[PDB]
Amino acid sequence: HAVIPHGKGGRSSVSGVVATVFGATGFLGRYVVNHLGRMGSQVIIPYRCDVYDIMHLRLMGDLGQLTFLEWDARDKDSIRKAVQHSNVVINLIGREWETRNFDFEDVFVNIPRAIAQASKEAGVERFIHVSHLNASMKSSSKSLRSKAVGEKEVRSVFPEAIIIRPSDIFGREDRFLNHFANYRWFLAVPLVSLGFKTVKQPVYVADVSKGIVNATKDPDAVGKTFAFTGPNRYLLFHLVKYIFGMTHRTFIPYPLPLFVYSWIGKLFGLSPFEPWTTKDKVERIHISDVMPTDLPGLEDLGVQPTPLELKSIEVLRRHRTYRWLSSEIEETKPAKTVNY
Amino acid sequence: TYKYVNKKEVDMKSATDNAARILMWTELIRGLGMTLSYLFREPATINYPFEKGPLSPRFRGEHALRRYPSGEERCIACKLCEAICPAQAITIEAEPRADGSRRTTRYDIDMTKCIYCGFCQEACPVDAIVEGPNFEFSTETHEELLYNKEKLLNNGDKWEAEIAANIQADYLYR
Amino acid sequence: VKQDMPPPGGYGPIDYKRNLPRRGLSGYSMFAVGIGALIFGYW
Amino acid sequence: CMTDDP
Amino acid sequence: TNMTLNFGPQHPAAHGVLRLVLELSGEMVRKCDPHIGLLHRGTEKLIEYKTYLQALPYFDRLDYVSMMCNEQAYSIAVEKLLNIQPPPRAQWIRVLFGEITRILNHIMAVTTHALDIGAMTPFFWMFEEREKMFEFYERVSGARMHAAYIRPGGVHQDLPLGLLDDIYEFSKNFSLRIDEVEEMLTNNRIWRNRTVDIGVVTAEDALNYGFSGVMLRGSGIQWDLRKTQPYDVYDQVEFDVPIGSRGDCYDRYLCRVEEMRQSLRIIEQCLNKMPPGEIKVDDAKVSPPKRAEMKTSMESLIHHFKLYTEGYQVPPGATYTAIEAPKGEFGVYLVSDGSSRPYRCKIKAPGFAHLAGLDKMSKGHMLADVVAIIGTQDIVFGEIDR
Amino acid sequence: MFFINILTLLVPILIAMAFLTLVERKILGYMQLRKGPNIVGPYGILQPFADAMKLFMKEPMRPLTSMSLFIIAPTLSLTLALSLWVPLPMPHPLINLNLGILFILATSSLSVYSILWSGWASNSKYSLFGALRAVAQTISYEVTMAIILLSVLLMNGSYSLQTLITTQEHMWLLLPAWPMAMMWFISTLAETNRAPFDLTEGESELVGFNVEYAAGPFALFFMAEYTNIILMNALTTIIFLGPLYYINLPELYSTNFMMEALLLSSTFLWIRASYPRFRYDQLMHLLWKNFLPLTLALCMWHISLPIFTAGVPPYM
Amino acid sequence: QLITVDEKLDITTLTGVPEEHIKTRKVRIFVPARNNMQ
Amino acid sequence: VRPRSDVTHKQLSAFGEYVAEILPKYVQQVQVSCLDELEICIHPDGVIPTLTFLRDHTNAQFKSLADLTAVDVPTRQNRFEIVYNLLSLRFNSRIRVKTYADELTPIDSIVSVHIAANWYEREVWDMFGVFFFNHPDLRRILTDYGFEGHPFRKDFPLTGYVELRYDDEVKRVVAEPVELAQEFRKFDLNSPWEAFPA
Amino acid sequence: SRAEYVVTKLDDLINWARRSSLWPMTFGLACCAVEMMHMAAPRYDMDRFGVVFRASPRQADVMIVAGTLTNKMAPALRKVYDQMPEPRYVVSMGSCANGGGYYHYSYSVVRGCDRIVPVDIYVPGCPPTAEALLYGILQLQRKIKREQKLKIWYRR
Amino acid sequence: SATRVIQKLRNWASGQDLQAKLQLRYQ
Ligand SMILES: NC(=O)C1=CN([C@@H]2O[C@H](COP(=O)(O)OP(=O)(O)OC[C@H]3O[C@@H](n4cnc5c(N)ncnc54)[C@H](OP(=O)(O)O)[C@@H]3O)[C@@H](O)[C@H]2O)C=CC1
Ligand code: SF4
Ligand code: SF4
């Protein structure tokens, strides 16, 4: 079972990767389908969002490259038919807010298991499972711990299943960068420990995507637990200010106990419509980026990471004002890098 | 022979006439009368789903492949329908069917490429490809618009009765 | 076999000229009725 | 109105 | 940049797609540099790769308000190169549908002009009449517009049995419909203002910038290629060119309403005097054989097969043939090698010249004036962009 | 009670305001040989409610612009227009104001800002050019609009709109003062930016403050314009066409007020379809050259008619 | 007055062709033979 | 058979000599072809002079420029064949003056003689690449703003080398080398049998 | 009372409002524009169905791309698609915009608008008949009717 | 098919006879 790769390399060409991608509608997802579609791969995108929302993905895929299937996580049968004819399964199912009808376990461990489980029954050559970086089975945030729980299980349902483990991602439409920039509405921008001792290493979304895609088309990655990290680390302080810097909005880092702040996250979490901050998110935000001692991701998988400052201008531009909208990054001052 | 579209005394009667035209907007009132008049005319619109705008037999509409009464598809893959298509829409590849006869393995009209010229209707010697009456085949996805032999043959079977009547009415003219 | 052709003797005649009618109350008469209305109203 | 025959 | 402001491609005011990069000191236009090619599609290069009969459908699309009149220009051109001329009935047909098409163009030009000006009821009044005309096209060609009826050797198929009668009922009444528009716009106390003395073009300047259309006729130059250089049987009919004086948006308009009137005079005649006969040349060499003949006679099948698959095989030469399309002089310069597919086919578009004049017409004019002048040139971006 | 009398006088007008768009999209239709909207609901009665719901649901995109001079502008437009119905004297008014017409003139004048604020807020060229011209003709027309009223008042004796019901107990003020009615009607057409005078929404000209306004903001001005369309027509139906008043039965006043207002509201609908739009300068050429000299002179005639015809109106 | 250039007219720089299709494309000048069929 | 009127063939021929004598210097060939159309062929340097004589001569007033075009015969050393078609509302006739221009040997501009040519000359530069000296503002008219290559040249691929699609990653339209999903089927149509020239 | 029911009904209302009043912003590139002006015209009144004659790039619910989307106009189309509200839709009209049409192999024509704007209903025909557009606009109305945005919110 | 009164309102308002040249095509 395979498809000889013919063509010159662009759209309307063939690469031979038929791939179910269950959580494509996501920020990371959007990018994964982009490269897969650019390369000419056959992409099956399972969806449970309404057809109007899935429209953005149609255009990057060539005619007949993208197939959309109706799928429900609780219903095992839907996952069954999606992987019927795929040979690569990529799992990006994740959320930050435990929803009424889906718990962190479900979105991270429960569902992503059933999926790979079926994929095996199907006989998919490889499964790529994505879990957050620094995910201990004991990490504070229920999210991270639960994700850790999953990367274990799925091994047993699907052995030698690649497990890329990305850091918080930097990209347009990302949270890491937009969240902080959107603190503008808040007059003061709380920062636990005044934004210190939680060094963070962002990674451009595309780098992550390209990396993921390259995995699909490379035999070197099997059972590998890569870690796409980034080109430079940062104390949360510079990051926050830098953001506000490009956004050209004032910065008032304010110390606020994580204790009390976990409570603020609880407050937003209470909100019915997509809580903006999450008790877990808060914790995750402060969880310091771990140093790298694992299977190299970017570069190792073939893409050289892209510095944050380089594309930050595009992600944070929408947050500027009438005039600030015309400033460029090189006249601006780039913040210092703290490896710690 | 030519004509001057706009090629051109002052008397109280005249002036008073002209001044009244400017002062009490007499010609403007004339224009209002015309629109009030139609307000009273019967509207020309048709209930679109219930009543349909009339199309006579030559209407080109949607492509279909016909079959002989017996049940043998008319096309014999001479492939000049492909030759004369202006848009390169029709793609035909053929091979001798086991019967030994000549038939098209693949006949694909790309309707998005097709500009509905109706020359294919013209060119076919057996008149296998015809411009069918239906114009309502709008589709949610681009792929549905690309049509293979099975869709066109199915289109042919569905509309054969009217296609036969339409060709019956217009063949003397051709 | 029959060919659509003009009816025998030709068709009837069509209008190719504007038939816009120059119909209006004469200006003096128009002003007088109006001024008379204001005079009655003022009284 | 392609054909005036029902 | 004197507040340079793209008229913008998406604008109801701009026919189709026109970026008019205009520098306006407040509400006065200092300079208009129209941008074109927003609808270039390759029509001239594509034709080189297609046979003569499969390039006929391109001409309908060049300026599709005037669907057929354009075909006639290619027809005539291909007939000249072959030194073949159409049969007598076909000629009258082409003049019959040639004129019907002129009306269709003028109903568009006059009513669309008003919609940009702000009068919206004339468009609905005359689009119903248009609709009725389209139906003629459909019952003759099969398509409402983009017919492909006028082919290089005559028309494709004789008129349905009964069309002439209906092209009469309509013609018998259409006049009143033009009359109505009139009672609404010709003398409106306001149409005149926005149109009168706007975009006056001198006579010498109109010839110099190659205007060649109503635009020339409106300035008082008397030139109708249909009377000066008769094509088809427009010679046997009798009509009056509507020349204008004090050429300005209002005067030319009056001219377009007058040719709508004169075309009804030409249509009447064509119905009164169309001859019994064939509608396509009898040279199977140029015109495709009748389907009864190709299905019973070998020479006819061979001629049907070769004509549809390969082509006319026009003798080598080059010709510039111009007709009087509703917009103005539409001409095809068709260079041709002995091959069945053309070598070059520059389409002269009445419109490439007219737009150019926008600059020399709209000078010291307000934003609203520019909208009025694009209307008085009947710009269909298909012909300009080709 | 007074609260109930605020629902009535508001809702009723809002519901009627919705039915005007419908009677606009059908009367323009039949004039143009088309049925107009009849498929949604019965005879299109549910049509106004339908797009209202579509408009509010669609995203109110805030341009990459002010965020207040953007949201203040529609609120002001709806607030002033609905407010000006407060003192209108149908039968007897809700809040009778001794200087009532000055209230109506002042409240109208404030709406010109909403146009100015929306145009500055959008921060795109089409909006600013449109607003500057729009503000210009609105206040230009205000100058003749005000003088035309001052001529009226001097023959009414007071600024209170309630007095005209007693002034017009024998004859409409159209018979006298018809020359100004026409000039009040044309000015009412300019101030509601309706057709003959609608270069603001001129589409071919400046596609204009509403350009960047979509969804909820679009609706509020929108609602405002149409309510105004009625209010100004209603002021014509009190000041110049005086509906018959019988003290014993107050509703025949409102019944005829209903009939005359609807017909004159129908008239600006009919004007729109019938006429092309005037040029920006052609519009101001009319007011400053054609109308202002007529109005100022006829203003003097209305200070003289009272005195030498010993008809000075009774104050109060 | 005319100027002298011994440089083979190369106008590869003006034609507007992508670099790949000017350096990797071999064209053959041949007189077409006849389909033996005819 | 077309209704040829020899009356014309002669009168136009006679004018063709007239012009040839009046401007011996630039006219290389003059020929009234069948179809009764006269074409005076001029050396490229005679662009200004030959046109001006036709625009302003009492016995030959050719006031409007119907068209300016450039066939491209790749075989011909001088690739382009600029053709100017002119009409004479006074003598109701048409003449075509055609010159030859190579890719990098520019022709003079006639915007002076006829301002109609302001646009067509820009059209010829954009499509064929001929350059016109003394042109007021020569710049691409029909092609895209960033288009590379002159399209109507016989050596330019129909489909071209670049096509546009919207890319989400970059959220902007982006060129890519053309990849077609059904190449233009190049039917060979010439028949191996000629037609004995009448 | 089951909210699920309460939700469906509510959604329907929402769908009825958008589906009854679709204000189309039409481009009129090319000619298929003439066949849409016919729809707006009296035989086939678009308004009767709640489709407004025309609106600006903002207040527009649906964009009808009529005509060839040439490479120069391709950046604009997008801009205007990107300048419309959150509930927006695109009805491709014409073989010249469904795919490439007679001009598919040209160097200046984008082979389809669905390469530049996501397309919801493709209306076929070189001059797609006005009735056919009307059929296409009516199928967009059935597409909207089926959309169930709040029920997915509730079940998400 | 319209009452003569309503029809008259039409002819009067128009100034010519629409009855002779109607918008409704008939057999
Ligand atoms: N920066 C980041 O976002 C990082 C992400 N990751 C991991 O990478 C993955 C992708 O991230 P990202 O795209 O931002 O995540 P998103 O929040 O964008 O969600 C990803 C997709 O999962 C789908 N989804 C969510 N919940 C469910 C459910 N209960 N059933 C079915 N589908 C569901 C969503 O579809 P819909 O919304 O239509 O339901 C969405 O399209 C995540 O799983 C995350 O754990 C790791 C590190 C950093
Ligand atoms: S022409 Fe008629 S028969 Fe010959 S191939 Fe095309 S369709 Fe089949
Ligand atoms: S599709 Fe046919 S009709 Fe519509 S634009 Fe392209 S060519 Fe003109």
Side-chain angles (χ1 to χ4, degrees), chain A residues 11-12 48-53 55-56 58-59 62-63 72 95 99-102 272-274, chain I residues 78 81 85-89 114-120 143 147-149 152-156:
Chain A
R11 91 175 314 173
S12 293
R48 65 182 181 88
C49 54
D50 63 307
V51 175
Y52 171 55
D53 289 345
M55 293 277 167
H56 67 258
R58 268 177 164 84
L59 60 80
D62 201 84
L63 276 66
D72 167 46
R95 273 307 194 192
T99 176
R100 185 171 72 262
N101 37 17
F102 285 100
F273 184 91
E274 295 199 2
Chain I
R78 188 55 174 178
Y81 177 67
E86 199 67 270
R88 62 191 172 189
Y89 319 98
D114 64 9
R115 308 222 310 181
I116 308 300
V117 285
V119 169
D120 289 345
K143 180 173 196 129
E147 95 186 357
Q148 289 132 22
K149 302 182 132 312
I152 76 181
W153 167 87
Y154 180 86
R155 185 182 295 276
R156 182 167 64 185

Side-chain angles (χ1 to χ4, degrees), chain E residues 53 56 74-76 78-79 82 84-88 90-91 94 149-156 278-283 286-288 312:
Chain E
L53 182 52
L56 177 63
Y74 176 77
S75 178
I76 294 182
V78 198
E79 271 154 37
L82 288 153
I84 198 55
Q85 63 180 20
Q91 289 173 341
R94 297 152 163 236
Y149 190 54
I150 300 189
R151 299 198 180 178
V155 295
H156 185 219
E278 178 162 346
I279 62 100
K280 49 183 48 182
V281 191
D282 299 353
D283 198 8
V286 186
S287 64
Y312 297 139

Side-chain angles (χ1 to χ4, degrees), chain A residues 22-30 32 46-50 53-54 71-74 91-97 99 101-103 106-108 111-112 115 129-133 143-144 147 164-171 173-177 203 208 212 228 274 284, chain I residues 152 155-156:
Chain A
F22 290 94
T25 322
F27 156 82
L28 178 50
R30 282 190 184 87
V32 175
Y47 72 118
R48 65 182 181 88
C49 54
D50 63 307
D53 289 345
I54 212 70
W71 90 283
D72 167 46
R74 297 294 181 192
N91 198 89
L92 296 174
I93 287 68
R95 273 307 194 192
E96 293 71 23
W97 46 89
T99 176
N101 37 17
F102 285 100
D103 52 63
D106 296 349
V107 290
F108 302 133
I111 300 309
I115 284 177
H129 180 256
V130 157
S131 178
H132 181 38
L133 178 63
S143 305
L144 274 42
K147 305 185 70 57
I164 298 179
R165 295 176 64 186
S167 64
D168 61 356
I169 306 183
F170 157 83
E173 308 154 350
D174 72 348
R175 306 289 186 174
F176 160 76
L177 200 72
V203 49
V208 181
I212 301 176
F228 302 175
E274 295 199 2
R284 188 186 305 101
Chain I
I152 76 181
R155 185 182 295 276
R156 182 167 64 185

Side-chain angles (χ1 to χ4, degrees), chain E residues 47-342:
Chain E
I47 284 161
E48 305 170 1
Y49 286 93
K50 301 194 178 305
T51 177
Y52 283 96
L53 182 52
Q54 71 184 349
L56 177 63
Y58 274 137
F59 280 80
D60 289 345
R61 294 178 179 83
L62 296 178
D63 178 354
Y64 45 78
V65 178
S66 60
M67 289 84 57
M68 288 180 175
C69 289
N70 296 341
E71 327 179 8
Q72 186 173 355
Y74 176 77
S75 178
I76 294 182
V78 198
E79 271 154 37
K80 287 184 177 177
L81 275 178
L82 288 153
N83 289 284
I84 198 55
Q85 63 180 20
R89 192 166 162 95
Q91 289 173 341
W92 285 100
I93 300 288
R94 297 152 163 236
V95 179
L96 190 147
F97 280 93
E99 296 298 350
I100 294 187
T101 305
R102 176 167 289 95
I103 299 177
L104 290 185
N105 181 254
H106 295 327
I107 275 174
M108 180 171 174
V110 157
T111 71
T112 299
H113 183 197
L115 262 180
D116 302 330
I117 304 301
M120 68 193 88
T121 77
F123 162 103
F124 293 79
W125 297 356
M126 302 303 251
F127 261 54
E128 183 65 13
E129 315 315 295
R130 187 166 185 174
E131 160 83 22
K132 301 179 176 180
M133 275 168 286
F134 269 12
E135 299 183 351
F136 297 146
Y137 265 58
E138 179 277 345
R139 54 184 312 181
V140 308
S141 67
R144 295 191 90 220
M145 86 195 260
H146 294 344
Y149 190 54
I150 300 189
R151 299 198 180 178
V155 295
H156 185 219
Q157 312 185 24
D158 207 340
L159 302 185
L161 182 45
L163 174 80
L164 293 185
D165 298 23
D166 302 5
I167 307 189
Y168 176 62
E169 311 293 350
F170 157 85
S171 58
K172 183 168 46 58
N173 303 359
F174 189 58
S175 179
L176 207 73
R177 300 288 182 268
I178 301 182
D179 290 345
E180 291 160 334
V181 166
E182 288 287 58
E183 283 187 349
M184 274 290 289
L185 304 181
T186 173
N187 301 355
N188 194 52
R189 192 174 312 275
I190 317 170
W191 175 260
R192 301 181 49 86
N193 281 353
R194 291 177 64 84
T195 59
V196 177
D197 288 317
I198 301 301
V200 172
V201 296
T202 308
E204 183 65 13
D205 292 271
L207 302 183
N208 193 31
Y209 297 138
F211 273 1
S212 68
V214 178
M215 307 263 296
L216 292 187
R217 292 193 297 274
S219 295
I221 312 138
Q222 308 185 4
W223 183 261
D224 216 357
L225 281 166
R226 301 177 294 169
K227 298 196 82 70
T228 59
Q229 307 165 4
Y231 50 93
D232 285 2
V233 293
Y234 270 92
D235 52 352
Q236 310 178 21
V237 304
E238 185 174 28
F239 64 98
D240 301 339
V241 186
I243 307 302
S245 63
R246 176 167 286 275
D248 48 37
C249 289
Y250 179 72
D251 179 80
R252 56 180 49 93
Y253 153 79
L254 268 192
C255 289
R256 293 182 183 174
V257 155
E258 196 56 50
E259 292 177 350
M260 288 177 72
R261 295 183 181 277
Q262 299 299 313
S263 57
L264 287 166
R265 183 196 205 162
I266 304 156
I267 275 170
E268 171 204 0
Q269 307 182 203
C270 300
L271 295 174
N272 299 2
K273 316 145 61 169
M274 182 176 282
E278 178 162 346
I279 62 100
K280 49 183 48 182
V281 191
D282 299 353
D283 198 8
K285 298 292 184 289
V286 186
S287 64
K290 249 182 229 196
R291 291 177 64 84
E293 267 189 317
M294 67 174 282
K295 285 168 202 205
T296 47
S297 57
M298 160 73 55
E299 323 193 14
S300 314
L301 183 48
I302 284 187
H303 284 54
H304 187 279
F305 191 95
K306 290 296 306 177
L307 283 193
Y308 286 82
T309 75
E310 194 221 351
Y312 297 139
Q313 205 77 346
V314 302
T319 53
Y320 176 77
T321 189
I323 60 173
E324 274 287 358
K327 270 61 175 81
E329 183 178 2
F330 190 78
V332 177
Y333 177 55
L334 201 161
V335 170
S336 68
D337 184 49
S339 56
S340 164
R341 71 171 65 199

Side-chain angles (χ1 to χ4, degrees), chain B residues 115, chain E residues 41 61 146, chain I residues 30-32 66-68 93-97 103 125-128:
Chain B
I115 62 100
Chain E
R41 293 169 295 181
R61 294 178 179 83
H146 294 344
Chain I
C31 67
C32 310
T68 295
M93 172 179 196
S95 85
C96 277
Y103 306 105
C126 203

Side-chain angles (χ1 to χ4, degrees), chain A residues 12-270:
Chain A
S12 293
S13 307
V14 49
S15 180
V17 188
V18 175
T20 60
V21 56
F22 290 94
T25 322
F27 156 82
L28 178 50
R30 282 190 184 87
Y31 292 76
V32 175
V33 172
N34 209 52
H35 285 87
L36 270 185
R38 176 183 299 101
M39 290 196 172
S41 295
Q42 188 64 60
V43 201
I44 306 185
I45 294 135
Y47 72 118
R48 65 182 181 88
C49 54
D50 63 307
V51 175
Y52 171 55
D53 289 345
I54 212 70
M55 293 277 167
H56 67 258
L57 274 66
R58 268 177 164 84
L59 60 80
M60 68 193 88
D62 201 84
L63 276 66
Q65 259 173 215
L66 298 199
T67 300
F68 311 98
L69 280 66
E70 186 65 13
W71 90 283
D72 167 46
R74 297 294 181 192
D75 168 58
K76 292 182 292 297
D77 208 30
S78 63
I79 298 142
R80 300 292 180 85
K81 300 301 290 187
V83 303
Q84 186 64 60
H85 295 83
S86 176
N87 63 34
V88 169
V89 179
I90 297 148
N91 198 89
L92 296 174
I93 287 68
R95 273 307 194 192
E96 293 71 23
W97 46 89
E98 216 155 13
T99 176
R100 185 171 72 262
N101 37 17
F102 285 100
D103 52 63
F104 286 118
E105 298 76 4
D106 296 349
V107 290
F108 302 133
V109 48
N110 305 13
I111 300 309
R113 157 214 46 186
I115 284 177
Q117 173 184 173
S119 77
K120 204 179 61 178
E121 299 149 14
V124 297
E125 192 260 325
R126 72 169 85 233
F127 169 81
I128 303 176
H129 180 256
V130 157
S131 178
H132 181 38
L133 178 63
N134 66 34
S136 300
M137 292 198 306
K138 306 304 301 177
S139 177
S140 307
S141 64
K142 176 179 304 181
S143 305
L144 274 42
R145 28 182 157 180
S146 61
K147 305 185 70 57
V149 179
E151 37 187 358
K152 167 204 308 180
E153 164 62 18
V154 62
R155 311 296 79 256
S156 63
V157 296
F158 204 97
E160 304 182 3
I162 302 181
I163 314 291
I164 298 179
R165 295 176 64 186
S167 64
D168 61 356
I169 306 183
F170 157 83
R172 67 179 59 200
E173 308 154 350
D174 72 348
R175 306 289 186 174
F176 160 76
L177 200 72
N178 300 11
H179 191 261
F180 302 146
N182 196 22
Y183 275 114
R184 167 60 173 183
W185 288 58
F186 310 92
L187 281 54
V189 189
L191 298 178
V192 178
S193 69
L194 196 60
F196 291 117
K197 199 178 182 304
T198 61
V199 63
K200 272 190 163 184
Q201 182 178 173
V203 49
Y204 193 62
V205 46
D207 310 356
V208 181
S209 69
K210 299 174 53 184
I212 301 176
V213 171
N214 292 181
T216 75
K217 51 172 189 56
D218 172 31
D220 187 22
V222 49
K224 306 305 181 306
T225 311
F226 298 90
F228 302 175
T229 59
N232 46 14
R233 299 175 68 95
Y234 296 97
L235 286 192
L236 187 55
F237 182 77
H238 317 109
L239 279 176
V240 180
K241 65 185 182 186
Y242 176 90
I243 297 178
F244 280 109
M246 301 310 304
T247 312
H248 300 102
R249 299 187 184 272
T250 199
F251 182 37
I252 315 88
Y254 154 65
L256 179 68
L258 179 74
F259 317 81
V260 178
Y261 193 51
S262 299
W263 169 58
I264 312 304
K266 185 182 187 61
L267 306 179
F268 289 78
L270 164 64

